[PDB]
Design a protein around this ligand. Structure first.
Ligand SMILES: NS(=O)(=O)c1cc2c(cc1Cl)N[C@H]([C@H]1C[C@H]3C=C[C@@H]1C3)NS2(=O)=O
Ligand SMILES: N[C@@H](CCC(=O)O)C(=O)O
Ligand SMILES: [Zn+2]
Length: 259
């Protein structure tokens, strides 16, 4: 019996620092959907755990050339963490190196715009040039475009990869701030979950437009062949069927809505 090392990321409303975290210790310093989920997964699987924020603040991508994985995926692949409980997207390239539980939350790539922006779809973005658009560095959303075969998406990637100054951002907050401060000249491509969350946060000046570009979900990840895999997957199913996952999404997304 050993304390499970949990890697996660500071991303609202999944994991956030508590107001007086400086006066708290260990897992008590954090709050959010994934903090709540972590406690439940651990309780049902019967293990003690320690939440740790991923060092490089990234989700996970493999550097072409160096072939080294960064972010939470990296912490799992190189043995720094035993499990990842965060808004980590299930993708083929990742499932080839780590294991994923069935999804605990659904999402799709979506468009965030400053209210009033002349955009209603991805096709709209790909057909104009006045409004710039980008995605998060090191994420599944960037990969989606980099490897998309679909016309509208291949065209969009071609623009984004060559846009100057860079249309990519280091963090979701950076993307959101760019939308809010660009007077409608910047649209941000991000997962519906984050988009929906920000839409219910003051100043209530952003909006999700159009339908989602794809359909996927977040899963709890473990190193390939881990002993925790089975139990965690069963826990996710149990918690999903008992309605806890829905309860947690409402608690962190809409129950505390500010708009
Ligand atoms: N509506 S939501 O995003 O909070 C949400 C999304 C999903 C849930 C449960 C909730 Cl509450 N459960 C499923 C899980 C239950 C089983 C059927 C599909 C997987 C395994 N995942 S999902 O379809 O990605
Ligand atoms: N959830 C994504 C990060 C957010 C994004 O790429 O938009 C991932 O696991 O890479
Ligand atoms: Zn429970």
């Amino acid at each position: 019996n050993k304390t499970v090392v949990v890697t996660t990321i500071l991303e609202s409303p999944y994991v956030m620092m508590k107001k007086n975290h400086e006066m708290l210790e260990g897992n008590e310093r954090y709050e959010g959907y994934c903090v709540d989920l972590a406690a439940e997964i651990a309780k049902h699987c019967g293990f003690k755990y320690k939440l740790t924020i991923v060092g490089d603040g990234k989700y996970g991508a493999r550097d072409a050339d160096t072939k080294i994985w960064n972010g939470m995926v990296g912490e799992l692949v190189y043995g720094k963490a035993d499990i990842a409980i965060a808004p980590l997207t299930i993708t083929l390239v990742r499932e080839e190196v780590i294991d994923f539980s069935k999804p605990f939350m659904s999402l799709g790539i979506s468009i965030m715009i400053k209210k009033g922006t002349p955009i209603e779809s991805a096709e709209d973005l790909s057909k104009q040039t006045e409004i710039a658009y980008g995605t998060l560095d090191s994420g599944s959303t960037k990969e989606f475009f980099r490897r998309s075969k679909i016309a509208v998406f291949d065209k969009m990637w071609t623009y984004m990869r060559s846009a100057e100054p860079s249309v990519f951002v280091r963090t979701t907050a950076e993307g959101v701030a760019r939308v809010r401060k660009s007077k409608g000249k910047y649209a941000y491509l991000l997962e519906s979950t984050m988009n929906e969350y920000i839409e219910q946060r003051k100043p209530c000046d952003t909006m999700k437009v159009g339908g989602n570009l794809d359909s996927k979900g977040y899963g709890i990840a473990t190193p390939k062949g881990s002993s925790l895999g089975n139990a965690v997957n069963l826990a996710v199913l149990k918690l999903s069927e008992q309605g806890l996952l829905d309860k947690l999404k409402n608690k962190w997304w809409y129950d505390k809505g500010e708009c």
